[PDB]
Amino acid sequence: LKCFQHGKVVTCHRDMKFCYHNTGMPFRNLKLILQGCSSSCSETENNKCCSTDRCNK
């Protein structure tokens, strides 16, 4: 999977079956990105787990 881990779409390791988009905690004035790749992601509504390339756009 190649996903936007560093903002740019980068190739995640072969262990990484999922790319995650974590929204963090609802905070205002806080722009922190929690987009990386995961080997075994936990699908929640807080953190979304997609397994398609460039999904975490």
* The amino acid at 14: R
Instruction: Determine the Cα–Cα distance for residues 54 and 57; give it in Å rounded to an integer.
Output: 6
**Experimental method, per PDB record:** NMR
Q: With left for phi above 0 and alpha for psi between -120 and 50, is residue 39 left, alpha or beta? A: alpha
Structure tokens at 51: 């397994």
Q: Just give the CATH number of 1-57.
A: 2.10.60.10
Comparing CA positions, the residue from 41, 3, 57, 47 lying closest to residue 23 is 47
Structure tokens at 16: 């990484």
Helix or strand holding residue 13 (H, E): none
Instruction: Determine the Cα–Cα distance for residues 29 and 57; give it in Å rounded to an integer.
Output: 21
Instruction: Determine the Cα–Cα distance for residues 37 and 19; give it in Å rounded to an integer.
Output: 4
Residue 6 exposed, middle or buried by CB count within 10 Å (0-12, 13-18, 19+): exposed
- Domain boundary assignment for the chain: 1-57
Structure tokens at 35: 């987009």
Q: Find tokens 């996903």 and name the residue.
A: 3
